[PDB]
Amino acid sequence: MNYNNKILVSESGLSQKHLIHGDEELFQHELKTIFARNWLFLTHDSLIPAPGDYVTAKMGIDEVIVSRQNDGSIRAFLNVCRHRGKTLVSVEAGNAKGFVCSYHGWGFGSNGELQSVPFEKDLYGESLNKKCLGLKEVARVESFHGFIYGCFDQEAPPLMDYLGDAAWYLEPMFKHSGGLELVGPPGKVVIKANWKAPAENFVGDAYHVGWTHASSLRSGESIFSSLAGNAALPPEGAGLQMTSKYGSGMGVLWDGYSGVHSADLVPELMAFGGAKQERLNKEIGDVRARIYRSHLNCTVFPNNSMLTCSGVFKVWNPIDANTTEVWTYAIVEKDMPEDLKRRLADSVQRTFGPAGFWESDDNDNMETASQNGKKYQSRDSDLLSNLGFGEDVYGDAVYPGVVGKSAIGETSYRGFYRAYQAHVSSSNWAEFEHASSTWHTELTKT
Amino acid sequence: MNYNNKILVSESGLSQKHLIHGDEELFQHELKTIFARNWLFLTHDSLIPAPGDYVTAKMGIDEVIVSRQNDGSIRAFLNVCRHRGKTLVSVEAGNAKGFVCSYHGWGFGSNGELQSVPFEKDLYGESLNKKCLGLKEVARVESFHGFIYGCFDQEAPPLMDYLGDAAWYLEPMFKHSGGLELVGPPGKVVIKANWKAPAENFVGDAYHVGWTHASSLRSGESIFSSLAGNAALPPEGAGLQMTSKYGSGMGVLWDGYSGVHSADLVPELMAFGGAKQERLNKEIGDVRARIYRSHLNCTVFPNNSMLTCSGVFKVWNPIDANTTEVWTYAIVEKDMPEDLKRRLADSVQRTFGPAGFWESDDNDNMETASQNGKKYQSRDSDLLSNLGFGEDVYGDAVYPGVVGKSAIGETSYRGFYRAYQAHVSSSNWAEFEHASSTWHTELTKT
Amino acid sequence: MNYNNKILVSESGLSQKHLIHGDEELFQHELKTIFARNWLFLTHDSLIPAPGDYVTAKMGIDEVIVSRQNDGSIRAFLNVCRHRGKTLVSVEAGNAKGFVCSYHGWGFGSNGELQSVPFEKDLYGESLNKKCLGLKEVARVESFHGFIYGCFDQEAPPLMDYLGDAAWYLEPMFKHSGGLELVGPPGKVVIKANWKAPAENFVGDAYHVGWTHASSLRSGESIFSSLAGNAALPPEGAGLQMTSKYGSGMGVLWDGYSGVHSADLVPELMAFGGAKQERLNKEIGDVRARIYRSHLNCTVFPNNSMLTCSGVFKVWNPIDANTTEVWTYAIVEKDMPEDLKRRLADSVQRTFGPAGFWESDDNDNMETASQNGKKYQSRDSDLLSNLGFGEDVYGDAVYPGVVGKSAIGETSYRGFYRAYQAHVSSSNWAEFEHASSTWHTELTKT
Amino acid sequence: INIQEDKLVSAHDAEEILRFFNCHDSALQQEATTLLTQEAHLLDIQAYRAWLEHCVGSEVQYQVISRELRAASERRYKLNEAMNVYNENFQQLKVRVEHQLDPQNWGNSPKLRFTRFITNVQAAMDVNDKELLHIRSNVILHRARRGNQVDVFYAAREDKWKRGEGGVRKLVQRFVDYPERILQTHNLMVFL
Amino acid sequence: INIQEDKLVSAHDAEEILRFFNCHDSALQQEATTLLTQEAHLLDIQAYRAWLEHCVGSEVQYQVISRELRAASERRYKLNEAMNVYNENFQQLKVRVEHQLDPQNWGNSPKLRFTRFITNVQAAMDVNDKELLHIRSNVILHRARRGNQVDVFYAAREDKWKRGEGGVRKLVQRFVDYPERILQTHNLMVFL
Amino acid sequence: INIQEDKLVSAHDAEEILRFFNCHDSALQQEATTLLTQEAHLLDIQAYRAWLEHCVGSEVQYQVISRELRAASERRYKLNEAMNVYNENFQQLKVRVEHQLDPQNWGNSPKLRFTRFITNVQAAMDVNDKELLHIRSNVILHRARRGNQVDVFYAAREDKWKRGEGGVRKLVQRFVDYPERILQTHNLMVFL
Ligand SMILES: C=Cc1ccccc1
Ligand SMILES: C=Cc1ccccc1
Ligand SMILES: C=Cc1ccccc1
Ligand code: FES
Ligand code: FES
Ligand code: FES
Ligand SMILES: [Fe+3]
Ligand SMILES: [Fe+3]
Ligand SMILES: [Fe+3]
Structure with missing residues (x-):
């Protein structure tokens, strides 16, 4: 395959060839041009x-x-x-x-x-x-x-x-909260999926939550629980999506500080995050203080993801096109009481660790979507990421990056895959830069 | 490998390069040109x-x-x-x-x-x-x-x-019997063989029966049992072999209506088939009524095989060059008594299912013949299918197709591999047709 | 990869690209040009x-x-x-x-x-x-x-x-001892290493013994035991290294007739070897009689190795670039008492067989060095074999071949890899010969 | 067990639980353990004739099924749910035993190696037939052949055993619902 | 056991050995075997509610850890040695059970197949709490799903069981130190 | 068993069957189960010195063979049928134990994880030596190391145990005929 010429990702990141999740030659090429x-x-x-x-x-x-x-x-x-x-x-x-x-x-x-x-x-x-x-x-x-x-x-x-542009969103939790600690050791599990399947899911997939995680939402009683079985669509202004030049992106779900944590942690967390937010209003302003205590599902390109507030921290370590070694840590705020940190860490693993019941909901989705990329009639088929296209903005007065002002969409898929294609077709950083000089214009067309 | 030029199957289908059972690049090429x-x-x-x-x-x-x-x-x-x-x-x-x-x-x-x-x-x-x-x-x-x-x-x-030409042979059982039913669900087992190994065996391999299945013939008491350990060659006129333009072919063993079924089903089956044959004489003539109650070992090109009368129905699902997922169903005649259908279905699985003792006799033969196709000194070696060559006919007054008027030979191997080579070296159906315009002449040379 | 041009082994065998232990295309090429x-x-x-x-x-x-x-x-x-x-x-x-x-x-x-x-x-x-x-x-x-x-x-x-030149060193034990017998059946174990990893280790690696085998040396009480944990360097003149035109080579450890055998065999062996040596002095001279009862770690190019006196005999059967099937036999001298032969055979398997505690020390070394050859940042890295370079001789009056007159060095690595590179870049024996017409000069430079 | 509440439990499985929860007889569990251990020993050393003679009743049904994968919510599709990998009477077991012992069974040279691990033994007498013994046990079966072929089978076995000739308890029914739908062991040519 | 001499043995493991070497009670080992066999049967048929009701104490801690790989000679690095794959109280087990039984748990259709093999059972009463029963056992757990997915888990279980409602012995602690650091079974979503 | 009729059965295997079919002693099978469970526990926690001290007799022969694959019909070729993977006296076992415990055994860092599953226990006193106890059992041995290395061993063990110092029953012979000809577990460096 000629990676200079082959259109693996279409203009504006609207679609990707399914083979990208299955092709071993491309995996080898990614070792060079991505990793x-x-x-x-x-x-x-x-x-x-x-x-x-x-x-x-x-x-x-x-x-x-x-x-x-x-x-x-x-x-x-x-x-x-x-x-x-x-x-x-x-x-x-x-x-x-x-x-x-x-x-x-x-x-x-x-x-x-x-x-x-x-x-x-x-x-x-x-x-x-x-x-x-x-x-x-x-x-x-x-x-x-x-x-x-x-x-x-x-x-x-x-x-x-x-x-x-992703840094602006991470800073309230990563910097202004007083700092985070990573709780190790990580859980480690091999899944039969391409690394891009969970990376794309964490970067921009709010759509899947109500349906994929119906059982976990219903069983755990977490704060996003009204979504179970697509029983209810989040209200207008429930959140937003963003993406950036070098491929990192995230979803923002306003106020969701207790995240995926089961009801046994909700009151304590919602109290703690709100208290710190009240202090942060004076420092970084209302919007950014609110972002601090809002749930961010983020991928730092290429293969590091996280759910802030939930405290889930992931590395999708590539093995081959249909094999990924998943590392799962917990993130906690340094100034949380030690007992809360311990319970938060256990809860991260309970939901998204090796026996994470939420993470288990995703297994078949990631594994089969990846393995289908090897199947003859699907290699040249188009994976769609067009949701919200033509409604994204750039250079907003409040929220930076390419932004979709809605909680559910595929804005962050498009930016992730735009950067991916620019790297795969480039021999060095200079070529990536040249291939990216109109990155936001490409993403906001129509 | 250049599939336009590479002679994988020699003229008249007389031999095939052993690599065809082992080469993964060719397997990938078969996904396109065969499957x-x-x-x-x-x-x-x-x-x-x-x-x-x-x-x-x-x-x-x-x-x-x-x-x-x-x-x-x-x-x-x-x-x-x-x-x-x-x-x-x-x-x-x-x-x-x-x-x-x-x-x-x-x-x-x-x-x-x-x-x-x-x-x-x-x-x-x-x-x-x-x-x-x-x-x-x-x-x-x-x-x-x-x-x-x-x-x-x-x-x-x-x-x-x-x-x-294969249709003419299948019709007495598939159509004139009143119709067949497939009894599911199928057995499913993975074997470490190329899909072509069992496909070629079912299409035209009567030679192996007495030796490969010596123990099953001796133990089960079926009607082909005189063959056990090559103790006895079938008489003259015991059967024939046929093959066709698009690769399908079969062996015909006259009168063998109870097939591989152990003695516990022989009298009932031989009575049932003979009774229907007597009715069919008036409808489709003596020869075709006899074909109805004759044992047909058939491959419908490329990877569907069957033993009529025995009632074995196979799909050789390709996984890679040395891996095949075997699906086994039973076929029964719709107008058989329900109790007979049930016992026939169990007997099909008993002999040729996941724990089929007959099918087990074939395992090492198929697996090693396939795996040897990967071995360095064997890749360019020639698998022989010349038995009966120069004695086949076409356009016979009674039996259509390319026909060998003997029970044991390699007529159906040659037609299977002739069609295989024509597909592998062609980019579309038009090219296959052009490559096949003298198909029967090629098979009946000498 | 163009094997005519690609420098996989540098001049004088001083280094090898790490990919040689991991590259499957090269493995396939070795089936042709090596095996x-x-x-x-x-x-x-x-x-x-x-x-x-x-x-x-x-x-x-x-x-x-x-x-x-x-x-x-x-x-x-x-x-x-x-x-x-x-x-x-x-x-x-x-x-x-x-x-x-x-x-x-x-x-x-x-x-x-x-x-x-x-x-x-x-x-x-x-x-x-x-x-x-x-x-x-x-x-x-x-x-x-x-x-x-x-x-x-x-x-x-x-x-x-x-x-x-390797034959001269093997002859005292293989010929002048009265002859050897191979005791079967061999142990057979699969390791996840390239065949070259154990081949290179046996051909010329005395350096690893004190450190890799520290625990086995300390626990078994064998005669090389002073080496445990690099506690002591062998004295001057403790041995030598040699290599040859067609790649075979070995280390010689003077007098080490009981080899790796635990103390329970040391006195009997040291008595037996010394007695035969005294007879051999008159036949083949003092030096060669001493070589007879000296420990030789040898690889007969490409994938047959042995430890004389210890009696270990190995075949490193290639499966793929990171898979090798290890066959282990015992060699004994025909004129040893039968009870000694039996105990020697058991001791060979005890130390270097499927549960050989010495051989187990080597597992991680061979497997990881091989598997690292597949890792992206290591493929183009250089494995070093420069120890003793510039001190080797050829044409010595007493010891033939390219010889390093020291017990520990990498002389035999260099000759092994020089021959390997000459084969890999050649289409036939004539080309190997042309590529090898200055073999000893290349090895003794500087 | 209430299968309306315990939604994943089949009626059949709930019935079988009930059998063993009731009259627990320690001595019976030990007799059953002995019976199954000796049966497994005979099979492991490939004493197939001895197995038939000592372990298998003349009225035996020896059955291993493979169940088609269906939706947990499925309620309409009612065609054959399973096929029989085995469904053997005594004579059919004898055929299979003769096939194993035939000197022209080429697959048996070099000789196979079997190792069976029997665990989780439970035993209970039938309520209505005081001579019918229900035994449940799980098996791991390891088959090795031809240098590097290794196949491992896993199953739960629902048995009925009854006293026969000489008062010896013999297998009159074995039922296995094989847990893997697609076999990855070349075949199921082993006696579970 | 002297762990200064037996250099590879941890203080914890040496303590647990001592427990079972002392007062060996044959009847207790048999009660324990029955308890664990019945528990495994309930789990195998996916009677998760029945398992909670019959086998699990209200005060349970159900814990499975994964220990970071460290040097045998390590003495300085003192950060968290393990993470909890499971560390569940009764309510948290109930959440997991409801998740299994939810009709929108898509991963459970077609129905999974579980087979458990329980071996090496040891039992001893606690010295100080004569109502606390220590039970050790090993499990092989086979999970098959979706035609060709097969995952096999292996573990040693350190349990405490105590008599609860109706005098029924129930699990009040399970501790497993999972032996494989990197899971090769897609997940650890099984009750060991 | 008549090995002329049961064509696949070796003389040795038929002899060993006979041993356990005769005087079945329930209490002896339970003593044997305890002995083997405790032995396996010591090995699993890598208490190799304790294993030697408590489980292994001074006169022990600890033997694991690998048998060459030969034709079932072979009658002429009479050279060495097997090699010894293990054939150890007490001192040789001690060497292997010291090798395991040596702080420069680099392969043992990070620490290995062992889990053993012992099943199918049978026990019978010797006819002629009323102090010699024959014990047969099967083992699955799981060894995990270095994140993602997993090796599983399967074997039947023919043991002789005899009362030694302090009246403690100790292993005086273990014989294993390893069922897999080509090992796919990197090595056989485990005590079966
Ligand atoms: C992508 C996973 C996720 C999980 C919870 C909320 C938003 C996103
Ligand atoms: C190819 C299998 C077969 C089996 C029985 C009769 C003829 C052919
Ligand atoms: C290469 C293995 C070896 C073992 C003992 C002595 C010298 C070399
Ligand atoms: S609905 Fe998104 S992958 Fe099917
Ligand atoms: S006789 Fe036909 S493959 Fe050997
Ligand atoms: S010191 Fe030689 S490989 Fe590291
Ligand atoms: Fe998800
Ligand atoms: Fe056949
Ligand atoms: Fe070494």
Whole structure:
């Protein structure tokens, strides 16, 4: 397939070829043009707070070691020995000044440097240039209010610019709330879906909630519960959708601070969020303080998603075109009482973890939509994302980005897939930029 | 591999490259040139007799919904939602006026039309063109005496013409017997063989019976039992072989009405078939009445096979080059007593079902012959099908098609593979026809 | 990938692209340029000593039948029926005058000839040319002191020349000891590693022993035990490394006759080897008699390895780029007391068999180093084998081949990979020879 | 169990629960365990004749079904719900046993390896036929052949056993509703 | 067990061993076997309401954890070692049961098939609370759905059971440390 | 069993059947169940030293074989039929235990997870040695490590147990004929 020419996503992101969820050659191409090029979620400050603390993480299909340095910075390295290529670290988290390879005993520092080689003097003499044998380092590592992302491409925009218009929406919860912590360890489960299926669902799919999650809405008594079985459409002005230049987007459901949490947490959460909102009105204004305590379903392009307020934090780690390893963490506000943080974390896993009853509702939808992308008569078929097209705006006086001023639509699908197609057909960041110079105009046509 | 030029099947169908049972690129090519082009078995009238009745079926690797319409006709549709591509129907059979997608709740009619979209007015307004969003429909659906076949290619010959000379042999049992019913549900088992291995075996392999099925012949006491361990060759005139332009073919074993059924059914069956034959003599003549009660091992090209009289009905559903999902139904004559139909159905499954002891004899033969097609030193090797070559005729005064007037030979292999090669090297039906304008001459050379 | 041009192994074998352990297209290319071209281990005289005795063996991904002929010779044939390609023999060893196919009953002789076809006269008449339907025969089968190797390529050098300089080192144990026997049946286990990972480890990796096998060294009390946890470097002159034109190579650890065997065998073995050495001094000289009772870790290119004295004998049978089927036999000296042979065989399996505690130490090293070769950021990375480079010699007065006069280094890696690259980039033996006309000069640069 | 409340429970399954909740007889559960363990041992070593002679009643019905996948809400479609993978009388079991033992059953060389794991044994005497013993048990059946073929079967078995010749308790009915609709084990040619 | 000598053994595991090595009560092991077999039967037939009513105490904690992979030599890193796949009180179990029984739980059509295998049952009364019964058992849980989906779960269960309403012994705590870190079963939506 | 009639049955297997069909001792089957459950518990928590101390006799032979695939009709080829995956005396088991516990056994970090399922227990005293207890049982052994590695082993175990120090019954012989010829579990480094 010629990725320069092949129209995988139609103009304005209105449709996508179904093969994108099934084609293994395209998956391999995505390793280069999506995962090696873009910012990918690694960890949080709260999981590696002290010098020597490290975790392992996936970046695409690669594995990296992410380590807190003595100077307080974070560096990340391929989890691959520079000698004969053995996996260096076999655990998920710990604290160490370095990592020794179990094959021939080469010792690397937390800073990636090759520090020791067994019997170096007797064996290599002075001929081994250890300075050139440091672990292969992730070129870019940046923080968004404690959330640590990596990028293999030195040419990428800074993480803040990459978030584009989405940053404005995340800031009330990520920054102005006093800060978030990530509660680990994550749940980890393999699903038989393409990574794009859950990514697209979290970025912009409010439509599915009442029908897909009918049973969970009815059983859990959460605050979005009136939606169960499409019994009721959210009122006018119940929310909005947004998307951005580099593909990140989200839905906003006004005031939904208790999110998917079952009735046993609703009063406490609604009290806590409202109290902080009242303080925030004075700082960031009424609208942004309200956004803080509003439910955001967001994908940070390409494969990191979250539900703020619900506190669900996801990585959709790609394995092959029909296999994804799902990592699930909980996010909590740092200044919540510790007992509330614990119960919130358990509730995140209860609803969206490995045995998350909400997440289970989505399984068949994601898996079959993905697997159908391999089926002969469906490869060249068109997945539709036209809901709300022709009603989106850009440059609004209050809400930035490409915005659909309605709670349910496909605005964020279009921006996600516009960015996806621009990357897939480009060889580098410069070409993506050229392919994106009229991004918002394309999305707001008609 | 260049499929225009590559000789996968030699002149007159005398041999085939072993790679055809193992090559995944060729498997992918077959999805286009075999499965998307030809007639494939779906279901029987008896399994969807009333309006709203539906079943799911495979067509190649695709899944379809096959539904009885209010007007009595049958239509079939891809089991894929037109919105974001989720699998619409997750059951195997039922009765419904429509199908609702569990992802976003789109409702399709039994006629494939998009009938309802949740909150359409509020969300899409008048902008959603539902008329253009019907399920992707199987272009051609036709019946052969209740047996329903589908074809994705609008250009295919009518099913009756496609059956060619094979139809004459099937008619006494399929039509003149008063009609057949398919007894469901089918057994379903995955084997590690290429779909062509069982297809070729059923189309024309009488040679294997005495040796492969030695133990089943000896243990079951059926009427073909003298063959056990190649103890005895069938007499002269014990049967014949035939093949046809579009690839279908069969063996005829004279008088073998009780087929593979164990001795506990032999007297009853031999009485029943003989009684109906005596009536049929007056209607269709002695020869055709005898064919009615003769054992036919047939493949309807490409991947539907059967043993008449034994009542075994097979679909070899392709998964990949070394994986096939085997569906097994029983066929019974409509006017048989109900108790006999029940015992016949159980006996079909006893011998050739998921725990069919006869079918088990074939497992290693099909699986290893298929898997060897992937092995380096065997890919370019030649599978032989030359038995009886130079003794076949065409245009016989009594028996139509390319016919070998002997019970055991490879006549039907040659016609099957001649048609296979003509399809694989052709881009459409017109090219197949051009490639087949001297089909019988090619088969009867020498 | 263009294998004529792609530098997979750098000059002097100093490094290899990590993709070589993961790339499936290259694996397929190796079936042609490595496995179909080179000598592969089949069996030993001791496992098929009498006429009619046979075993099955893999050659690459192909399976062969290896049979002792009436005249005392050995012939080997593809385990594939010449009719419709069924696997002929389903057992691992036995005694027979021929093999009958379970599909249609064709009977082949132990000499590969098609001897009988059921009902040939009635079915084929005189038209079947059985003379042209013999099993596909392995072109070359030769013995190295009872060890039987096969090669599909008629153009290969004789096995003795193929062993090149490695033969001189093997001869004291393989020939001058009075001869070895292979004790079967082998252990068989699948590991998730590329075949090259264990092949390279056995050919030249002494460096890993102290660290990888720290626990086994400490627990078993064997004679190499001072190495445990890199507690101690072997003294000067503890051993050497060698490699050869056609890729075979080995390490020599002086005097290590009890090898990996736990203390319960050390005194008996050290007595036995020393006694035979004292006799051999008079026959083959002191140096070669000492080599006899020295531990050799050897790979016979491409995928047969061994530890002499330890008595471990390995075949790394390729399945795909990250899958290898490991066969483990024991080698014993024919003139050892029978009770010692039995205990030695058990000890080989105890240490390096399916539950070999030493072999288990290597699992993660081989599997992860192989699987990392598929990971995007590692494919184009360089595996290093530069230890000892610039200190190797050729044409030494005492020790032949390219030799590193030190116990620990990467000399044998370099020669293995030099030969590998020359084969991968060549279409035939003539091209390999041309690509190898300065093989030792390339290895001894600097 | 009220199946109007416990919406996922079939009438048949609710009836079978009731059987074992009532008169719990410890000694009977132990007799049943012995019976099933010995039966499984005979089968594992492929003593198929001994199995017939010692474990199987002359009036046996040995039945394994495969049920078509239907909608949980389905109420209209009423055609055959299941097919019989097995539905054997004694003579039909004997045919299958002879097929296993035939020296020209090529699939049985090299010899197969069977390992059965029997768990969750429950036993209760029938209310009306005080000589009819109901036994429920689950089986994991592992079949290995030809180097690298491995098939694992999982099932619940509803048995009736009754005293026969010599007073030996023998199988007079086995019913299995096989839980996997599409078999991924090459075939179901094992005695569950 | 001395965990200073038996280096691979955790303090928790050593404590649990001690419990069962002491007063071995044959009758108690049999009561426990019956309790667990009947519980598994109710679950297998998807009688989730009956399971709650008959098997689960009002004060239950139903907990399944997933432990982060850490170095055997790790001594410094002290953050949350595990997450809760389940950590349910009775009301939370009831929510999950209602979710299973809801007619708009699309994932449950066609009906799932469950088969559970309970083994290695051990039972001992608590030292200090003579009404608290400790039961340990292992489960293999087979879930089949939608033709060709098959998921098999494996776990050890540390239970506490106590007599409740009507004198019926009910589950008051289940603890499972799930042995596989990355699930390869699509989800863990089964009651272990 | 007549092995001339039951053609698929080996002489060895027929001999072992005979052992358990005869004097059935209910109490002995229960003692055996306890012994094997406790042994499996010690192994599952990786208390390998405790296993040696409490479960393994000084005179033990611990043997697991792999049998070469041969024709069912084979009568001429008479070379070594099997190899020993294990064939260990007490000292050799101790070596393997020390290897497991060594802090430089890199493969054991992060810590492995074992779950064993023991079923089909049969027990009978030896005829001639009234202190020798024959125990047969089947094991499913689940080993999970490193996130996504899962290996499942299946086997029948022929044991002899005898009273040792302190009157404690200990394993003096275990024999397993492993049913899969080519292992698909990376290795057989588990104590069956
Ligand atoms: C995409 C998941 C979701 C879940 C709850 C509310 C909005 C969106
Ligand atoms: C191809 C299977 C077959 C079975 C019985 C008779 C003829 C053919
Ligand atoms: C490569 C394995 C090995 C094992 C022992 C000594 C030298 C080498
Ligand atoms: S592979 Fe890491 S030290 Fe050699
Ligand atoms: S995918 Fe079917 S309604 Fe959206
Ligand atoms: S395939 Fe061997 S005789 Fe036909
Ligand atoms: Fe959802
Ligand atoms: Fe057949
Ligand atoms: Fe090693």
